[PDB]
Short mmCIF file of N, CA and C and ligand atoms in Angstrom, two decimals:
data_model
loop_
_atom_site.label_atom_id
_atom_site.label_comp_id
_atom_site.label_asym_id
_atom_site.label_seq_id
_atom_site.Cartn_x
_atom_site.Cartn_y
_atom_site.Cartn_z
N UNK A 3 -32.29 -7.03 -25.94
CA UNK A 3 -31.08 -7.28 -26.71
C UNK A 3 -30.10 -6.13 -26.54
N UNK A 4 -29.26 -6.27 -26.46
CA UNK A 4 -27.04 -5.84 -26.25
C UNK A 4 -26.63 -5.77 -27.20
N UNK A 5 -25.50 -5.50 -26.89
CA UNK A 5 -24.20 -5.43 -28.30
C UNK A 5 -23.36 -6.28 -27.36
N UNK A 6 -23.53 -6.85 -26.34
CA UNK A 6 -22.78 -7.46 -25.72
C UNK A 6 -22.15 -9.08 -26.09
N UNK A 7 -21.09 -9.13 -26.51
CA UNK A 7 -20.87 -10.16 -27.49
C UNK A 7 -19.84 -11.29 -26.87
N UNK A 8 -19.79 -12.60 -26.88
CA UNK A 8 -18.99 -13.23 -26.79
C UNK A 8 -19.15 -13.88 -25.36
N UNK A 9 -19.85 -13.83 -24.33
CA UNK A 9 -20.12 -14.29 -22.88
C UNK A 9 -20.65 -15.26 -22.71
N UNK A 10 -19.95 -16.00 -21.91
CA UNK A 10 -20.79 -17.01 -20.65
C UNK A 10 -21.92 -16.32 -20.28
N UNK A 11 -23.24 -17.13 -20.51
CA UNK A 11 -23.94 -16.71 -19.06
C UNK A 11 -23.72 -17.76 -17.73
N UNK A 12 -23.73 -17.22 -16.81
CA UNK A 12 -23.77 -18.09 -15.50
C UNK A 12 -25.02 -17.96 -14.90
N UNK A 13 -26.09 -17.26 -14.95
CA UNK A 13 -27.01 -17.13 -14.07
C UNK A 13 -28.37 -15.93 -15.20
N UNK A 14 -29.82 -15.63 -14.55
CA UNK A 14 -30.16 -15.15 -15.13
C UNK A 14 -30.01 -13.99 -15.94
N UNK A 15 -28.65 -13.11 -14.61
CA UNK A 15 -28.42 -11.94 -14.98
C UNK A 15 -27.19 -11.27 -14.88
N UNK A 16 -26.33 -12.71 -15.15
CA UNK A 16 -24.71 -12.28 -15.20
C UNK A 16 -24.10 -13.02 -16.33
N UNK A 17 -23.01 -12.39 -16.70
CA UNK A 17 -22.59 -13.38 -18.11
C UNK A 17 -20.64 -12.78 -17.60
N UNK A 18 -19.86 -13.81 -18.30
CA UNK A 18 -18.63 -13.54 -18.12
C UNK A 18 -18.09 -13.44 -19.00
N UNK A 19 -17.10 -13.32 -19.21
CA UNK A 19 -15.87 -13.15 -20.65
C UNK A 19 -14.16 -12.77 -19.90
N UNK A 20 -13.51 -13.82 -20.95
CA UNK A 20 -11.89 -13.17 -20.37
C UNK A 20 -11.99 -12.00 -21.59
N UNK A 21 -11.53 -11.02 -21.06
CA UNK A 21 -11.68 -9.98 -22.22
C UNK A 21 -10.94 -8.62 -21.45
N UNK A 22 -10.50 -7.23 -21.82
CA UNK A 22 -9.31 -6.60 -21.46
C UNK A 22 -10.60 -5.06 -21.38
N UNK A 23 -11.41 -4.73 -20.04
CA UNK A 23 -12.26 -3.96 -20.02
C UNK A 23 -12.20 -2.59 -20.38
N UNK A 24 -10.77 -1.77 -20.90
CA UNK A 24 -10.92 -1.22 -21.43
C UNK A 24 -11.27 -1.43 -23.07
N UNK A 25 -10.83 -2.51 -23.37
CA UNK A 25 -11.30 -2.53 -24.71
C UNK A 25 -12.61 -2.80 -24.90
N UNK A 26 -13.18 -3.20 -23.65
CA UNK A 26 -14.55 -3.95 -24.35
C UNK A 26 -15.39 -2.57 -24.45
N UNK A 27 -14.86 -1.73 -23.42
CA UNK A 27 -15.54 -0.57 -23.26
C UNK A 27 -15.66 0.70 -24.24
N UNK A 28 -14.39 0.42 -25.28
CA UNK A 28 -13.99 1.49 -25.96
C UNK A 28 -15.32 0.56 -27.22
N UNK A 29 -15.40 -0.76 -27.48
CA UNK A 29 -15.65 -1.51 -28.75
C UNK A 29 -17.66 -1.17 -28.11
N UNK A 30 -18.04 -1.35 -27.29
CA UNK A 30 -19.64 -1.73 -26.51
C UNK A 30 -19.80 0.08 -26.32
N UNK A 31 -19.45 0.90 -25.91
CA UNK A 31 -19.75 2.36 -25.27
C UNK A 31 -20.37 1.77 -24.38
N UNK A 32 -20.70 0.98 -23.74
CA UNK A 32 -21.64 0.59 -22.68
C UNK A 32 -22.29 2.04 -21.77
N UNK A 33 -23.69 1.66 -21.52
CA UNK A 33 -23.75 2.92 -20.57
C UNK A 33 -23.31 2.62 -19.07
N UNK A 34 -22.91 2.03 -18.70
CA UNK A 34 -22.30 2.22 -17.39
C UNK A 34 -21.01 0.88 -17.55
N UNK A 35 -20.06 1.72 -17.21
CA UNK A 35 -18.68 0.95 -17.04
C UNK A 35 -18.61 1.02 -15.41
N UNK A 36 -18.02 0.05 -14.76
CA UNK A 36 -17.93 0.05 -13.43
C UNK A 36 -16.38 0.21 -13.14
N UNK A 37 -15.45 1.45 -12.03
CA UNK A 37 -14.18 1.07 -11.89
C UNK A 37 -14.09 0.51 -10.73
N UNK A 38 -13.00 0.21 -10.75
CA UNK A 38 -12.22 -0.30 -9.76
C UNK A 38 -11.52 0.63 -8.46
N UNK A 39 -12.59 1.62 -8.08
CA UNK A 39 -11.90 2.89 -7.63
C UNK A 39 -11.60 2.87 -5.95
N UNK A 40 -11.11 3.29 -5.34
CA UNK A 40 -10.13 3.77 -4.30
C UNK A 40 -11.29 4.47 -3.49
N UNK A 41 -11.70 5.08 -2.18
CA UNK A 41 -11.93 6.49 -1.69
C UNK A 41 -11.31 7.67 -2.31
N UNK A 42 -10.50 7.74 -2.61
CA UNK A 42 -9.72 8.88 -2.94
C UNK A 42 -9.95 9.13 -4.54
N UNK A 43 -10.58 8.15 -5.58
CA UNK A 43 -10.33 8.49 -6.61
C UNK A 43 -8.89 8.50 -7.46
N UNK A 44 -8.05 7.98 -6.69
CA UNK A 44 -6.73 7.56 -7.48
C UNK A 44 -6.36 6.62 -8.55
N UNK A 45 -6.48 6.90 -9.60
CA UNK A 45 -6.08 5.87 -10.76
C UNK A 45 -5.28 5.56 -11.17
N UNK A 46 -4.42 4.94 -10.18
CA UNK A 46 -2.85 4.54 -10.02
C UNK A 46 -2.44 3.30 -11.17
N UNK A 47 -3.45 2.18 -11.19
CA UNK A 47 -3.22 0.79 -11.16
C UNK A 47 -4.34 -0.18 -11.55
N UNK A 48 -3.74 -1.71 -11.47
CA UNK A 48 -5.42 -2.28 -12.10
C UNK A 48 -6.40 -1.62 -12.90
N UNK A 49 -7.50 -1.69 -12.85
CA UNK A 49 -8.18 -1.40 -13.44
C UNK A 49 -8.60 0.19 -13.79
N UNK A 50 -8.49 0.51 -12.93
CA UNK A 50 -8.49 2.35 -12.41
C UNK A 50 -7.43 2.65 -13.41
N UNK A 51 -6.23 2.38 -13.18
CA UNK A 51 -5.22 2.97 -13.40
C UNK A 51 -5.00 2.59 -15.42
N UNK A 52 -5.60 1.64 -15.46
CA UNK A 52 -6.49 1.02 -16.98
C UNK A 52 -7.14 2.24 -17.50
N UNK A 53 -8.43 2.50 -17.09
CA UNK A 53 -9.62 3.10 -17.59
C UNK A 53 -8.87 4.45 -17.46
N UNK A 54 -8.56 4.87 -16.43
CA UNK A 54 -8.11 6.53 -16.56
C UNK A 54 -7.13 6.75 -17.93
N UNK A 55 -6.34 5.63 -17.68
CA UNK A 55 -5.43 5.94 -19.18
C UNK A 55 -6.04 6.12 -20.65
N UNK A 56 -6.88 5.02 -20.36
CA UNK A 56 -7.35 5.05 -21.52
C UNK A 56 -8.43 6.63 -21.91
N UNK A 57 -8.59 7.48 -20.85
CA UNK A 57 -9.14 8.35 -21.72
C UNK A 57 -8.34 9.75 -21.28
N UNK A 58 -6.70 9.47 -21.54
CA UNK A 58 -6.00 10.54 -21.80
C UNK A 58 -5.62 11.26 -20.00
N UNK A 59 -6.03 10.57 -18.89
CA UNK A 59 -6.33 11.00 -17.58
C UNK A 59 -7.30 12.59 -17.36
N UNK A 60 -8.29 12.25 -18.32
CA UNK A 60 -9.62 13.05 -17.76
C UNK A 60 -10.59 12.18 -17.14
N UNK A 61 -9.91 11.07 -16.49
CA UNK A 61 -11.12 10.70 -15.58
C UNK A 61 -10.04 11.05 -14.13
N UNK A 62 -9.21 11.19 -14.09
CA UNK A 62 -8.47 11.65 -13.17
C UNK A 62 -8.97 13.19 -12.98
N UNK A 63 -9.37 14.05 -13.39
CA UNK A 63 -8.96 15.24 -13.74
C UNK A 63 -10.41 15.54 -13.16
N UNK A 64 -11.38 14.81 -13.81
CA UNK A 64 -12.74 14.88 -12.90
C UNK A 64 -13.10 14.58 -12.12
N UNK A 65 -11.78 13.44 -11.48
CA UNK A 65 -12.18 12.61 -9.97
C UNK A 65 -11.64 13.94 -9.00
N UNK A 66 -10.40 14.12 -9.44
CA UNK A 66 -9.89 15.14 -7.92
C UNK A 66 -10.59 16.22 -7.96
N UNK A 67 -11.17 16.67 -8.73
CA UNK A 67 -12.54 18.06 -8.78
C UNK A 67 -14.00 17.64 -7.76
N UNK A 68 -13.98 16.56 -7.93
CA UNK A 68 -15.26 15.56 -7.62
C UNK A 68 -14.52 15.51 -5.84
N UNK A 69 -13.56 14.66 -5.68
CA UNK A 69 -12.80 15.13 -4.13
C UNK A 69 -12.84 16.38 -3.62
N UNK A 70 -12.22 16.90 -4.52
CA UNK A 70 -11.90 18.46 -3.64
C UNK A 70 -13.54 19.03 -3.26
N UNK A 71 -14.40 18.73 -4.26
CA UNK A 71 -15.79 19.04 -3.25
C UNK A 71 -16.30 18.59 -2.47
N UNK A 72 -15.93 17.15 -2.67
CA UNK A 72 -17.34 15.95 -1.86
C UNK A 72 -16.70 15.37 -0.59
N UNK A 73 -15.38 15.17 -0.57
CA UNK A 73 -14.22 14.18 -0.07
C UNK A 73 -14.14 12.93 -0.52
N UNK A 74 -13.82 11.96 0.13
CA UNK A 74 -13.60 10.65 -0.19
C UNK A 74 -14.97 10.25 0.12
N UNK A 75 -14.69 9.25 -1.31
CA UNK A 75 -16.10 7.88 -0.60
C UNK A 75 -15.29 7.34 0.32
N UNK A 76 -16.92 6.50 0.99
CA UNK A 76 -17.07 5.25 1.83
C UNK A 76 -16.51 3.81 1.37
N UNK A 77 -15.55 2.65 1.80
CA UNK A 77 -15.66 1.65 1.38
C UNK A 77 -16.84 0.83 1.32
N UNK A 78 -17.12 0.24 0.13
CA UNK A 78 -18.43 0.20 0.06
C UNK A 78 -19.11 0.46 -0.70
N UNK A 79 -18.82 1.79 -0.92
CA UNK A 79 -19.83 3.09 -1.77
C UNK A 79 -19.33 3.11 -2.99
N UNK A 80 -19.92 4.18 -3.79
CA UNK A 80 -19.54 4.91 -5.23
C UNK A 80 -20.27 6.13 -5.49
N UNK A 81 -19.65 6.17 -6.42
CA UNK A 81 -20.36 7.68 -7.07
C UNK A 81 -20.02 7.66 -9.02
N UNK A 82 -21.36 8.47 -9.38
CA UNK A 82 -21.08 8.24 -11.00
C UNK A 82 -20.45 9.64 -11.42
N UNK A 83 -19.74 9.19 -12.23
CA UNK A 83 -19.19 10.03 -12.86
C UNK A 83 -19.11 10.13 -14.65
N UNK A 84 -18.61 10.76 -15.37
CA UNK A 84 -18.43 10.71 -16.52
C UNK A 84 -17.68 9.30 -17.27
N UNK A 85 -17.91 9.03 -18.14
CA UNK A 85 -17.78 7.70 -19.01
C UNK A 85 -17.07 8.33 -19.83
N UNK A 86 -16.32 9.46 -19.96
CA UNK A 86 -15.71 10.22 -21.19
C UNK A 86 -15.83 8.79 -22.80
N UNK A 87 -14.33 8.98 -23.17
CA UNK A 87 -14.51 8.36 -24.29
C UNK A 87 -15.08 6.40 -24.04
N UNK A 88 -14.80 6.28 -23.12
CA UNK A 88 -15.33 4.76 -23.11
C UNK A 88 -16.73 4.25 -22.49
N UNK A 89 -17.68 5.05 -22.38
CA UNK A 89 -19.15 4.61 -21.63
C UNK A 89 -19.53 6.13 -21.63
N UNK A 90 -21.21 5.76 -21.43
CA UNK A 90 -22.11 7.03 -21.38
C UNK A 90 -21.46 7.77 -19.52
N UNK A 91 -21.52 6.56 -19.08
CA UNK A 91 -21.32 7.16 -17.46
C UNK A 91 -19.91 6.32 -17.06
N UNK A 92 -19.28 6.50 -15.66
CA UNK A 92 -18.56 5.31 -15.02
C UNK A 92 -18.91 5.51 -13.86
N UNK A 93 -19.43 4.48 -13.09
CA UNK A 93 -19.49 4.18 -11.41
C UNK A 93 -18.34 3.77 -11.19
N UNK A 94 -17.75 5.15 -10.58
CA UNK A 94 -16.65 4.04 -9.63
C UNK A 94 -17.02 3.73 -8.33
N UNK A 95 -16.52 2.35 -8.05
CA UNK A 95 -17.18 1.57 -6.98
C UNK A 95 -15.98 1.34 -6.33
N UNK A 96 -15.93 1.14 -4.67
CA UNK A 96 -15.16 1.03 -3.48
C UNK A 96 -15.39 -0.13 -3.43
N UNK A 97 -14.25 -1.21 -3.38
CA UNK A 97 -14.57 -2.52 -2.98
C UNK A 97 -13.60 -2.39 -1.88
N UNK A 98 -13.50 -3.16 -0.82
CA UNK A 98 -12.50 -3.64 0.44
C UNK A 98 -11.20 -4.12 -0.59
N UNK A 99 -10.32 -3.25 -0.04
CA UNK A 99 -8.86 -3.83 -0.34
C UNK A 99 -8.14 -4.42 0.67
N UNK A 100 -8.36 -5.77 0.50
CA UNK A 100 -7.68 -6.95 1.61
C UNK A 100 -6.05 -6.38 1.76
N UNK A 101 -4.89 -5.64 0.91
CA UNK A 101 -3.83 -5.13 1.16
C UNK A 101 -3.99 -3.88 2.13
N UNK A 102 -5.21 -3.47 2.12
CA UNK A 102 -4.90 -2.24 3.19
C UNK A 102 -5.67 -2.89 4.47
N UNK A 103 -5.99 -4.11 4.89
CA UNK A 103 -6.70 -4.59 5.90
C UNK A 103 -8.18 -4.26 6.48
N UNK A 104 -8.92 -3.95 4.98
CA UNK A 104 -10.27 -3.95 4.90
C UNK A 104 -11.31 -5.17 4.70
N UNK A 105 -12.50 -4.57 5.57
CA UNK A 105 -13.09 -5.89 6.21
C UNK A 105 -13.89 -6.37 4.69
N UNK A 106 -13.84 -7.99 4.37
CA UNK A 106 -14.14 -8.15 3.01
C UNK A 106 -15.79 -8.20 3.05
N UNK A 107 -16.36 -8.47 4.23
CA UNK A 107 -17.74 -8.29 4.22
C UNK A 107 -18.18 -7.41 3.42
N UNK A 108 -17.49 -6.05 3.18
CA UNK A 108 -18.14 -4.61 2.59
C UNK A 108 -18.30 -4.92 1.40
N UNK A 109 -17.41 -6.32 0.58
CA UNK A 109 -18.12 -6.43 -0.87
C UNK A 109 -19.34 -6.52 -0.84
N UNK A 110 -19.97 -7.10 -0.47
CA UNK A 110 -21.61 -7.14 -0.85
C UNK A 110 -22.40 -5.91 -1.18
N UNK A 111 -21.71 -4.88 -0.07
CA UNK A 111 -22.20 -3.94 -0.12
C UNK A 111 -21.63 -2.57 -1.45
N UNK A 112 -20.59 -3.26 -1.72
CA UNK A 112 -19.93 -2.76 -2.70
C UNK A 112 -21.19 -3.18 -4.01
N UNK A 113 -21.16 -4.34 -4.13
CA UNK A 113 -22.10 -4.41 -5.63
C UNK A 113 -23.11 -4.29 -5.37
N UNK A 114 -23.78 -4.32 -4.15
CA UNK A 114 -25.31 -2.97 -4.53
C UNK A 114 -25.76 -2.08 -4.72
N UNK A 115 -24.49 -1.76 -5.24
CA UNK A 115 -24.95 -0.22 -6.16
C UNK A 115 -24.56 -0.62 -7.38
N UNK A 116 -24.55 -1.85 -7.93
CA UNK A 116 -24.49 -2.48 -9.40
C UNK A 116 -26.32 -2.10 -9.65
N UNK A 117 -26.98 -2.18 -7.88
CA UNK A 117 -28.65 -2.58 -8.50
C UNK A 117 -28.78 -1.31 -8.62
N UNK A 118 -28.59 0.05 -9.03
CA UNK A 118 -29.09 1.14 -8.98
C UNK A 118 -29.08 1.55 -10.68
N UNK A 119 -28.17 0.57 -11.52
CA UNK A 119 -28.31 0.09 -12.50
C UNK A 119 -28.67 -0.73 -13.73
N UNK A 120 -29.44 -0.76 -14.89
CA UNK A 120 -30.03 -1.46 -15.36
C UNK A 120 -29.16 -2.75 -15.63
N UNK A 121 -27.87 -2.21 -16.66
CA UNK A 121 -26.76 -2.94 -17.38
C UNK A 121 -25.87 -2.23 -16.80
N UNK A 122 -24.35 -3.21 -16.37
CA UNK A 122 -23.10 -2.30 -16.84
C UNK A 122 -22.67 -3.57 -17.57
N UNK A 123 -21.36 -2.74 -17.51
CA UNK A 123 -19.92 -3.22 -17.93
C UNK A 123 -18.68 -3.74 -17.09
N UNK A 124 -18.49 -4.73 -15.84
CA UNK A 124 -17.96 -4.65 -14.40
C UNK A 124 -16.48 -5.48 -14.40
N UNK A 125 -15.67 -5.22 -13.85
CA UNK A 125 -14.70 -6.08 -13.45
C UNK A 125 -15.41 -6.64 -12.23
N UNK A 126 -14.69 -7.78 -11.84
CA UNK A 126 -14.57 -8.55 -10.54
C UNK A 126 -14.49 -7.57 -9.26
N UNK A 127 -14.96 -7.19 -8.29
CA UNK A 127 -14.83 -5.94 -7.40
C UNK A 127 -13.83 -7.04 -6.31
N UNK A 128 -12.93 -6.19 -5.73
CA UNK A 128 -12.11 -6.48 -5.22
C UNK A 128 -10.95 -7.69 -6.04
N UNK A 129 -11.08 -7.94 -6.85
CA UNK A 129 -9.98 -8.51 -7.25
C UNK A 129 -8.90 -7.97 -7.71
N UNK A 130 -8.21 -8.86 -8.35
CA UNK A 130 -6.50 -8.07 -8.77
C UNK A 130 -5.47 -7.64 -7.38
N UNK A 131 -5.09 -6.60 -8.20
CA UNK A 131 -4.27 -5.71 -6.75
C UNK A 131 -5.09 -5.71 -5.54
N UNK A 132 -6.76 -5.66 -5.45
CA UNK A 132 -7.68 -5.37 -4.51
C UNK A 132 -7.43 -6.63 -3.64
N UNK A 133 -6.59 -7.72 -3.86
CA UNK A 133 -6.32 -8.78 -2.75
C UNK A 133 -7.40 -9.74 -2.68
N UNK A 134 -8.44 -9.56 -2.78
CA UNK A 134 -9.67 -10.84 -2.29
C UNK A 134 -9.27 -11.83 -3.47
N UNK A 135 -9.89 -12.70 -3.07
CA UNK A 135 -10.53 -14.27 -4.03
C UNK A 135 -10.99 -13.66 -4.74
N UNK A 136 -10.90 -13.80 -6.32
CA UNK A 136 -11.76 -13.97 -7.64
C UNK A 136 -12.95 -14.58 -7.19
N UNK A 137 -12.75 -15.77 -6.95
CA UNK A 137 -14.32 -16.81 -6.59
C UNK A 137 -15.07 -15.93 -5.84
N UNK A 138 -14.56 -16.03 -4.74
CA UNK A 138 -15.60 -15.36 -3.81
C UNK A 138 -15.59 -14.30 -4.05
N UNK A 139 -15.30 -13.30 -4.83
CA UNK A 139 -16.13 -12.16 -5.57
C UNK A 139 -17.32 -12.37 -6.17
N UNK A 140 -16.80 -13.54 -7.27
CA UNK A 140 -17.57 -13.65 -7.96
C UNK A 140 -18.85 -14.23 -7.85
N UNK A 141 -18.98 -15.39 -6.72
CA UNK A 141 -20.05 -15.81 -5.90
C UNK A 141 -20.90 -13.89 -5.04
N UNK A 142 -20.26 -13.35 -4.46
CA UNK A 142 -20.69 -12.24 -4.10
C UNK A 142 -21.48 -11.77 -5.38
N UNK A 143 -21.14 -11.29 -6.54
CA UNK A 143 -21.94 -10.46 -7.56
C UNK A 143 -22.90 -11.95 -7.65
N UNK A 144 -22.82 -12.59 -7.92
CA UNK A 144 -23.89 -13.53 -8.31
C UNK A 144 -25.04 -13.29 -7.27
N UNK A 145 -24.86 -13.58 -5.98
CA UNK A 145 -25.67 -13.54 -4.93
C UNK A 145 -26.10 -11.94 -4.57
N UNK A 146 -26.18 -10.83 -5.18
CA UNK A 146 -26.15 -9.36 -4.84
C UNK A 146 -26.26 -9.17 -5.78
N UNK A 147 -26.13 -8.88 -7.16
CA UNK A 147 -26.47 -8.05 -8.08
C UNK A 147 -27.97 -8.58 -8.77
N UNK A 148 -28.87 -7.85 -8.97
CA UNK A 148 -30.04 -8.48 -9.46
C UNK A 148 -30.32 -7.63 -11.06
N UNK A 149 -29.14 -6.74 -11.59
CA UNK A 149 -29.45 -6.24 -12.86
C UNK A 149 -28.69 -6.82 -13.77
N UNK A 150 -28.18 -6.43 -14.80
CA UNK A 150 -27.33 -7.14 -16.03
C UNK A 150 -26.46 -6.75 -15.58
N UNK A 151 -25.60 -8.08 -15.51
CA UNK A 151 -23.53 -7.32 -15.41
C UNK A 151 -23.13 -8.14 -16.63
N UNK A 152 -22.19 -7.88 -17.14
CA UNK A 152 -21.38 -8.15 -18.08
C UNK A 152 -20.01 -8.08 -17.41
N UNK A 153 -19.62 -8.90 -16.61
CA UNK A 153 -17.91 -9.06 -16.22
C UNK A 153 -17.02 -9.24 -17.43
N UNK A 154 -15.92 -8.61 -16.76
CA UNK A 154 -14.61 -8.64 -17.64
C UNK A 154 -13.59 -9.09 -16.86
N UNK A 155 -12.75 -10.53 -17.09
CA UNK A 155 -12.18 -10.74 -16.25
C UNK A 155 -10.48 -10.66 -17.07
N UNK A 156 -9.79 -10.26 -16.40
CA UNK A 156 -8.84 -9.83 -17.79
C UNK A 156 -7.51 -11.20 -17.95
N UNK A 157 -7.56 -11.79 -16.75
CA UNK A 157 -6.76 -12.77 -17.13
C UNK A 157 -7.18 -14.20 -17.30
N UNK A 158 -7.06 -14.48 -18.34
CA UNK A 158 -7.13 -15.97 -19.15
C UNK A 158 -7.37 -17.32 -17.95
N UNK A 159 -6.35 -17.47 -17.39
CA UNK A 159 -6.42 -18.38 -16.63
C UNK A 159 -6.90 -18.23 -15.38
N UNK A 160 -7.43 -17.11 -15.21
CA UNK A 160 -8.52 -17.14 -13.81
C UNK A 160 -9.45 -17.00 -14.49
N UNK A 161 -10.21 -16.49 -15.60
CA UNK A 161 -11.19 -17.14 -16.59
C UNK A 161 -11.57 -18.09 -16.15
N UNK A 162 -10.64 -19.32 -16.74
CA UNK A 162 -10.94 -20.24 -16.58
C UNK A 162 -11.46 -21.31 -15.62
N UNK A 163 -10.43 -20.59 -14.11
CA UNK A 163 -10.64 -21.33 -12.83
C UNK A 163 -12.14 -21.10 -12.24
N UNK A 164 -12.75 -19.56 -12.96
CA UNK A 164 -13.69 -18.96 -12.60
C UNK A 164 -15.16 -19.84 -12.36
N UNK A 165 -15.23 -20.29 -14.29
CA UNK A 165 -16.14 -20.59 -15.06
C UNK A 165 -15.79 -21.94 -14.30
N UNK A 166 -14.89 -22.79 -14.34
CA UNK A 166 -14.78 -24.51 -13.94
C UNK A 166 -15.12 -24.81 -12.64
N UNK A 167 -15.33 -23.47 -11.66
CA UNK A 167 -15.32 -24.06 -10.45
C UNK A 167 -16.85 -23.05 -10.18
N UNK A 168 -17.55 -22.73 -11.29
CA UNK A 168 -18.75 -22.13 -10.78
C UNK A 168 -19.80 -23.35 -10.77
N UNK A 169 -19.81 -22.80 -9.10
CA UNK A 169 -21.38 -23.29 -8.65
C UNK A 169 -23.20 -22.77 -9.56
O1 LIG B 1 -10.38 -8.18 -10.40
C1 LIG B 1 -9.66 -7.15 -11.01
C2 LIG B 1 -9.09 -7.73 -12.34
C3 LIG B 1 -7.99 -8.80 -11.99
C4 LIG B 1 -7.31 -9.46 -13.24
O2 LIG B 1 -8.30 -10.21 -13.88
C5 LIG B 1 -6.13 -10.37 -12.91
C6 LIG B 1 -4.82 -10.03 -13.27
C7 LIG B 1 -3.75 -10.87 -12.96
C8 LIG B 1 -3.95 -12.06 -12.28
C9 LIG B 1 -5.25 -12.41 -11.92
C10 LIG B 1 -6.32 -11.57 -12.23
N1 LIG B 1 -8.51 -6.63 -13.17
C11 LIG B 1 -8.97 -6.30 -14.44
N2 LIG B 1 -10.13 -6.89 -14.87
C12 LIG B 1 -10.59 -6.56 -16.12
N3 LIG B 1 -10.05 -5.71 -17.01
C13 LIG B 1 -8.90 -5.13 -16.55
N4 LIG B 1 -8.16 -4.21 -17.27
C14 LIG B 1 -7.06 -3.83 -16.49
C15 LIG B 1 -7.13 -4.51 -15.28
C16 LIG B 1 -8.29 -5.35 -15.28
CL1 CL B 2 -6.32 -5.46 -10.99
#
């Protein structure tokens, strides 16, 4: 048992919700929030640019510290970092951004590092600004993630198209 409240389940080990992931994150502390992050760690926008705000831009502040030692992730990849005020931890995760002409295959490989986790807290990887299909994201985490996700999908009416057209 969760504090995880209000979800679809779709499958043994995914559940959905239209819901606004910084809030769910500030209301759940979840221990792992998943971002929406860049190589570079830039929290410009979408979801990134969401979560960093919301904790005053000290997740900014720990990403370019985290760069200036490590360099950029891999598309693909992630790395954990601090959850300041909204989660115990945050993975930010590299999904393929179809606007910068990245190959979308790498989602898959993007949410297997959801399995290095028990539970999170996830947006859609590659969606939004990130350019891919919602669906076929969302078919991707279904088929690749084998731990608890709790998606947050933030707009209403792709909610909906989500849940009506899941296989
Ligand atoms: O897949 C990324 C997802 C896209 C979003 O659902 C969308 C917006 C407009 C049109 C269609 C779809 N972004 C988020 N998901 C959850 N919480 C969030 N908080 C801030 C951003 C955000
Ligand atoms: Cl977005």
């Amino acid at each position: 048992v969760n504090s995880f409240s209000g979800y679809l389940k779709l499958t043994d080990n995914v559940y959905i919700k239209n819901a606004d992931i910084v809030e769910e994150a500030k209301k759940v502390k979840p221990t792992v929030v998943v971002n929406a992050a860049n190589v570079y760690l830039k929290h410009g926008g979408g979801v990134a640019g969401a979560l960093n705000k919301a904790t005053n831009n000290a997740m900014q502040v720990e990403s370019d510290d985290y760069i200036a030692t490590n360099g950029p992730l891999k598309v693909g990849g992630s790395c954990v970092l601090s959850g300041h005020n909204l989660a115990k931890h945050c993975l930010h995760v590299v999904g393929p951004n179809v606007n910068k002409g990245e190959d979308i295959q790498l989602l898959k490989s993007a949410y297997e590092n959801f399995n290095q986790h028990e539970v999170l807290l996830a947006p859609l990887l590659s969606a939004g600004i990130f350019g891919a299909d919602p669906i076929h994201s969302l078919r991707v985490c279904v088929d690749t993630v084998r731990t608890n996700v709790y998606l947050a999908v933030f707009d209403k009416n792709l909610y909906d198209k989500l849940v009506s057209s899941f296989l």
